[PDB]
Write a protein that holds these residues in place. Structure first.
Motif, PDB file in Angstrom:
ATOM      1  N   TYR A   1       0.847  -1.184   0.000  1.00  0.00           N
ATOM      2  CA  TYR A   1       0.000   0.000   0.000  1.00  0.00           C
ATOM      3  C   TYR A   1       0.884   1.235   0.000  1.00  0.00           C
ATOM      4  O   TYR A   1       1.646   1.453   0.946  1.00  0.00           O
TER       5      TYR A   1
ATOM      6  N   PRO B   1       0.205   5.128  -0.486  1.00  0.00           N
ATOM      7  CA  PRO B   1      -0.824   6.156  -0.691  1.00  0.00           C
ATOM      8  C   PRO B   1      -0.496   7.179  -1.770  1.00  0.00           C
ATOM      9  O   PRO B   1      -1.265   7.333  -2.721  1.00  0.00           O
ATOM     10  N   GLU B   2       0.627   7.881  -1.641  1.00  0.00           N
ATOM     11  CA  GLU B   2       0.988   8.957  -2.554  1.00  0.00           C
ATOM     12  C   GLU B   2       2.274   8.613  -3.292  1.00  0.00           C
ATOM     13  O   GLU B   2       3.105   7.844  -2.801  1.00  0.00           O
TER      14      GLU B   2
ATOM     15  N   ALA C   1       1.556  11.326   4.280  1.00  0.00           N
ATOM     16  CA  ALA C   1       0.663  10.191   4.095  1.00  0.00           C
ATOM     17  C   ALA C   1       1.441   8.903   3.886  1.00  0.00           C
ATOM     18  O   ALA C   1       0.935   7.815   4.184  1.00  0.00           O
ATOM     19  N   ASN C   2       2.669   9.001   3.383  1.00  0.00           N
ATOM     20  CA  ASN C   2       3.475   7.817   3.136  1.00  0.00           C
ATOM     21  C   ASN C   2       3.887   7.108   4.417  1.00  0.00           C
ATOM     22  O   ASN C   2       4.385   5.981   4.346  1.00  0.00           O
TER      23      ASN C   2
ATOM     24  N   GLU D   1     -12.686   4.204   4.234  1.00  0.00           N
ATOM     25  CA  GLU D   1     -11.445   4.939   4.041  1.00  0.00           C
ATOM     26  C   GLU D   1     -10.269   4.108   4.534  1.00  0.00           C
ATOM     27  O   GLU D   1     -10.298   3.569   5.642  1.00  0.00           O
ATOM     28  N   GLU D   2      -9.232   4.006   3.706  1.00  0.00           N
ATOM     29  CA  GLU D   2      -8.027   3.264   4.056  1.00  0.00           C
ATOM     30  C   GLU D   2      -6.911   4.283   4.261  1.00  0.00           C
ATOM     31  O   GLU D   2      -6.086   4.527   3.380  1.00  0.00           O
ATOM     32  N   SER D   3      -6.895   4.885   5.449  1.00  0.00           N
ATOM     33  CA  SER D   3      -5.831   5.805   5.819  1.00  0.00           C
ATOM     34  C   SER D   3      -5.865   6.091   7.315  1.00  0.00           C
ATOM     35  O   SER D   3      -6.830   6.680   7.813  1.00  0.00           O
TER      36      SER D   3
ATOM     37  N   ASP E   1      -4.318  10.019   7.502  1.00  0.00           N
ATOM     38  CA  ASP E   1      -5.140  10.759   6.551  1.00  0.00           C
ATOM     39  C   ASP E   1      -4.963  12.264   6.718  1.00  0.00           C
ATOM     40  O   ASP E   1      -4.473  12.947   5.811  1.00  0.00           O
TER      41      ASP E   1
END
Lengths: 48, 42
Positions: free
Chosen positions: A35, A37-38, A45-46, B27-29, B32
């Motif tokens: 996974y 994210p960015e 977010a990483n 939501e997957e964070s 966030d």
């Protein structure tokens, strides 16, 4: 790098947390990422 | 009034009531920190 505290008033600021910072030859010989994210490397977010 | 907004094309598309919000999808964070107004539905 030194940190003091969010609410500290400009008058009396003193070191509260030392933190040594360096670079290492980081590598993952037996793992990968599932996974991401960015796209940008080294983002907030990483962290997840 | 229509409901939660899912997709904008503007005439935004509002979630179909028959299935959406799909309970599976969330939501997957944990990192966030989206901020602003975090509208959520279920």
């Amino acid at each position: 790098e030194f940190f003091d505290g969010r609410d500290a008033v400009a008058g009396a600021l003193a070191p509260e947390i030392v933190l040594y910072t360096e670079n290492v030859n980081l590598e993952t010989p037996d793992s990968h990422v599932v996974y991401k994210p960015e796209t940008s490397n080294n983002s907030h977010a990483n962290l997840g | 009034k229509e409901g939660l907004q899912i997709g904008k094309d503007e005439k935004p598309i509002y979630a179909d009531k028959t299935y959406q919000p799909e309970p599976q999808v969330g939501e997957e964070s944990w990192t966030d920190t989206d901020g602003t107004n975090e509208k959520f539905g279920g």
